[PDB]
From Swiss-Prot, chains A, B:
Coiled-coil annotated spans: none
Organism name: Autographa californica nuclear polyhedrosis virus
Name used for this protein in its record: FAD-linked sulfhydryl oxidase
Subunit annotation: Homodimer.
UniProt GO molecular function: thiol oxidase activity
General function of this protein: Functional FAD-linked sulfhydryl oxidase that is required for infectious budded virion (BV) production and for the formation of enveloped occluded virion (ODV).
Taxonomic lineage from the root: Viruses, Viruses incertae sedis, Naldaviricetes, Lefavirales, Baculoviridae
Pfam short name (any one): Baculo_p33
Signal peptide, first to last residue: none
Length: 258, 258
């Protein structure tokens, strides 16, 4: 139930490009351990792409795609892998998982993280349908995706920094788990409009309060994204550029029609 | 400039007990790598104990204490190490670093984390004195302390969970670094009373706003502590006990006279 907007369309495409570049790494994997980690990450990523598009995951078709990527020739170049990827996904009836744009940049990875955040918010708000158990399983998978992020591009500094602060995101996913658990035991979730209301609601001695900010992960990922960009100037020991600009929640909500 | 209260007194003692138990591990270290990690952690811990007590770190005396612990007999039992520790610290004029209580529990580690949080808040509010550079260095050390936490007691589940969410704490330390950097470049820090005000202040497109919650780390560590205890019921797949009780900011501020 995510609003259709130009930005969300870009997020979807970026997410598919990221997943495509991730499976392209399988044939070049330097170890069984890495192949396993990459294959699992890819399986989960495509699962969420299909959940939104097909309102279900094509566990079978996705597995066939991943199996194909694992066995693809390592001598093959990216252009050839692209071509064979398009043919394979067409054959597997996964045309909706094909990227339209192939320009890979940091925006691609950020877009991917923001896309997953919107999925989390949507799966929770519409939990009326699958089941609290299904959602809980999905959140566990989301934590694995965020605990493990493959940059594909090279940036050791980014990797080290993310290692240090990724817990900020994971912490909020756990807040959702707690809210769902409270609902299982009798207290329905009350959605609020601001992060401030959620913070105030959490400042109690009892567990009978169950307030959760609507669009929480969208806000959390936006805030995290701003933080990384605010901190890079400290990493470079420099004053931020005169035209450095941060994203505001009001602007972000408008862009995604939240 | 931390208020003297019964709770803070307990925090101080717990912090010293934690540090004592950490250096007791040196003589039993299974590798040079571990000895280095433990020695560095211990050096930083004692540095902050002395900073508060002696308004400076006894880099020399602390180094002598650590060197002593590294060379202590591995066959020695904890009671004997205690005795020799008391004699060594007396000799090194570090009597103020001697624990009064020796009962080690999870409370000991939590107290240690809350103590460091109060130190961070105090060093920042009174930055008028050392220098922005000194404080920045201290914060870097604090991040290392929180990125690395030795439980001493055994709890693999705790370790794994902390690994996943410690970024929530580190994220807020980086927020302080950003605030100090903004001050270096011309914008003084404006302290606010609530986390909600800090959140609202951060929701801007410019970098000219520099609002920081007073007692931020005290609030962050309290919130984190509540979160870990809220989540353990999910880990155990059980409803929280009927008498489970959480800490509130109002109660916490009163206990520490913040
Ligand atoms: C997980 C991760 C960690 C990183 N760690 C580091 C690091 O430690 N150091 C470092 O130097 N670089 C790091 N980077 C890269 C850095 O965040 C920027 O992507 C890069 O410097 C390029 O900046 P940019 O000016 O092109 O903007 P980008 O941030 O790349 O912009 C990408 C897109 O996101 C939009 N956008 C900007 N801010 C927000 C927001 N808050 N919420 C939503 N959309 C927004 C932009 O409008 C644009 O369309 C990291 C990237 C990722 C994905
Ligand atoms: C970093 C860390 C991670 C841990 N991870 C796990 C885990 O994943 N799973 C698990 O089962 N256990 C975990 N634990 C242990 C758990 O947090 C408890 O300490 C333990 O279960 C004992 O609970 P208790 O009821 O004795 O209260 P404790 O939380 O141990 O109480 C210690 C003291 O802190 C006070 N206090 C309580 N809440 C707060 C608060 N929010 N702020 C400040 N003071 C407060 C109490 O009043 C008491 O004096 C972890 C401990 C630490 C230090």
């Amino acid at each position: 139930g995510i609003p259709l907007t130009p930005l969300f369309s870009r997020y979807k495409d970026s997410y598919l490009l990221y997943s495509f570049r991730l499976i392209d790494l399988l044939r070049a994997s330097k170890s069984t351990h890495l192949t396993k980690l990459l294959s699992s990450q890819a399986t989960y990523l495509y699962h969420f792409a299909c959940l939104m598009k097909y309102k279900d995951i094509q566990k079978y078709e996705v597995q066939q795609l991943i199996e194909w990527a694992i066995n693809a020739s390592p001598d093959m170049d990216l252009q050839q892998f692209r071509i064979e990827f398009m043919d394979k996904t067409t054959e597997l009836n996964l045309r909706s998982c094909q990227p339209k744009s192939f320009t890979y940049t940091f925006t691609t990875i950020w877009d991917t993280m923001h896309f997953l955040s919107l999925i989390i918010d949507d799966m929770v708000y519409t939990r009326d349908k699958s089941s609290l158990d299904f959602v809980m399983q999905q959140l566990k998978t989301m934590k694995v995706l965020f605990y493990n992020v493959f940059f594909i591009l090279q940036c050791a500094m980014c990797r080290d920094h993310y290692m240090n602060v990724k817990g900020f995101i994971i912490y909020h996913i756990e807040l959702i788990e707690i809210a769902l658990d409270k609902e299982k035991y009798g207290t329905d979730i009350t959605f609020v409009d601001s992060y401030q209301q959620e913070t105030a609601g959490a400042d109690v001695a009892v567990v009978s309060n169950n307030m959760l900010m609507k669009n929480l992960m969208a806000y959390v990922s936006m805030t995290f994204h701003n933080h990384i960009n605010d901190y890079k100037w400290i990493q470079r020991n420099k004053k931020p550029p005169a035209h450095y600009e941060r994203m505001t929640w009001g602007e972000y909500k408008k862009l995604l029609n939240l």
